[PDB]
Scaffold this active site. Structure first.
Site, PDB file in Angstrom:
ATOM      1  N   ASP A  16       0.798  -1.235   0.000  1.00  0.00           N
ATOM      2  CA  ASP A  16       0.000   0.000   0.000  1.00  0.00           C
ATOM      3  C   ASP A  16       0.825   1.277   0.000  1.00  0.00           C
ATOM      4  O   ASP A  16       0.264   2.360   0.228  1.00  0.00           O
ATOM      5  CB  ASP A  16      -0.957   0.015   1.205  1.00  0.00           C
ATOM      6  N   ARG A  30       0.768   6.755  -0.163  1.00  0.00           N
ATOM      7  CA  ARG A  30       0.207   5.838   0.782  1.00  0.00           C
ATOM      8  C   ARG A  30      -1.236   5.638   0.330  1.00  0.00           C
ATOM      9  O   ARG A  30      -1.941   6.630   0.172  1.00  0.00           O
ATOM     10  CB  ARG A  30       0.200   6.360   2.222  1.00  0.00           C
ATOM     11  N   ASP A  35      -5.382  -1.043   4.468  1.00  0.00           N
ATOM     12  CA  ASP A  35      -4.115  -1.497   5.014  1.00  0.00           C
ATOM     13  C   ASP A  35      -3.749  -2.885   4.494  1.00  0.00           C
ATOM     14  O   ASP A  35      -4.492  -3.845   4.724  1.00  0.00           O
ATOM     15  CB  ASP A  35      -4.201  -1.482   6.548  1.00  0.00           C
ATOM     16  N   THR A  36      -2.615  -2.984   3.805  1.00  0.00           N
ATOM     17  CA  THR A  36      -2.099  -4.275   3.370  1.00  0.00           C
ATOM     18  C   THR A  36      -1.159  -4.794   4.461  1.00  0.00           C
ATOM     19  O   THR A  36      -0.627  -4.006   5.232  1.00  0.00           O
ATOM     20  CB  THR A  36      -1.343  -4.277   2.045  1.00  0.00           C
ATOM     21  N   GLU A  38       2.170  -6.151   6.317  1.00  0.00           N
ATOM     22  CA  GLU A  38       3.513  -5.583   6.213  1.00  0.00           C
ATOM     23  C   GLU A  38       4.522  -6.615   5.735  1.00  0.00           C
ATOM     24  O   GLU A  38       4.434  -7.798   6.061  1.00  0.00           O
ATOM     25  CB  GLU A  38       3.950  -5.024   7.568  1.00  0.00           C
ATOM     26  N   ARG A  82       3.906  11.577   2.936  1.00  0.00           N
ATOM     27  CA  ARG A  82       3.393  10.756   1.820  1.00  0.00           C
ATOM     28  C   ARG A  82       2.095  11.295   1.271  1.00  0.00           C
ATOM     29  O   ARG A  82       1.223  11.722   2.025  1.00  0.00           O
ATOM     30  CB  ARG A  82       3.185   9.319   2.321  1.00  0.00           C
TER      31      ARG A  82
END
Length: 136
Positions: A16, A30, A35-36, A38, A82
């Site tokens: 992401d 971003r 949320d992907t 980590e 970002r």
């Protein structure tokens, strides 16, 4: 209303977070609202489905003819500098595609950067129902 602008891939960092050329400069983006898992994470190294999400994003962006960024109506950058945006590959939203595949979950939502929240939660509810990947 929201509007799409062109961007050029530099490198996908993970599922992401993506480096793009936007308005003539490299910027880290971003993805909004998702949320992907980590791959870099300080405490844990790679989370389950981390590598999968990262390659999904990399493949979708690298094989696109056109990439576009869409800012929402609130803050356009986060405290880390970002850009905060929806990313489109040939007219297909990356943020949605990841969620629809069970490779990301819908974020914590910060009004008013939440224009496409309903749509992504509907794709997340479908990926869960289908028990895909993270939902497996």
């Amino acid at each position: 209303k929201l509007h799409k602008e062109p961007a050029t891939l530099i490198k996908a960092i993970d599922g992401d977070t993506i480096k793009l050329m936007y308005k003539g400069q490299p910027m880290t983006f971003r993805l909004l609202l998702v949320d992907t898992p980590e791959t870099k994470h300080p405490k844990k190294g790679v989370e389950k489905y981390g590598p999968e999400a990262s390659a999904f994003t990399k493949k979708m962006l690298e094989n696109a003819k056109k990439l576009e960024v869409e800012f929402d109506k609130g803050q356009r950058t986060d405290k880390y500098g970002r850009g905060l945006a929806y990313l489109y590959a040939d007219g297909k939203m990356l943020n949605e595609a990841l969620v629809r595949q069970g490779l990301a979950k819908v974020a914590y939502v910060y009004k008013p950067n939440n224009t496409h929240e309903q749509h992504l939660r509907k794709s997340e509810a479908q990926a869960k129902k289908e028990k895909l990947n993270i939902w497996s």
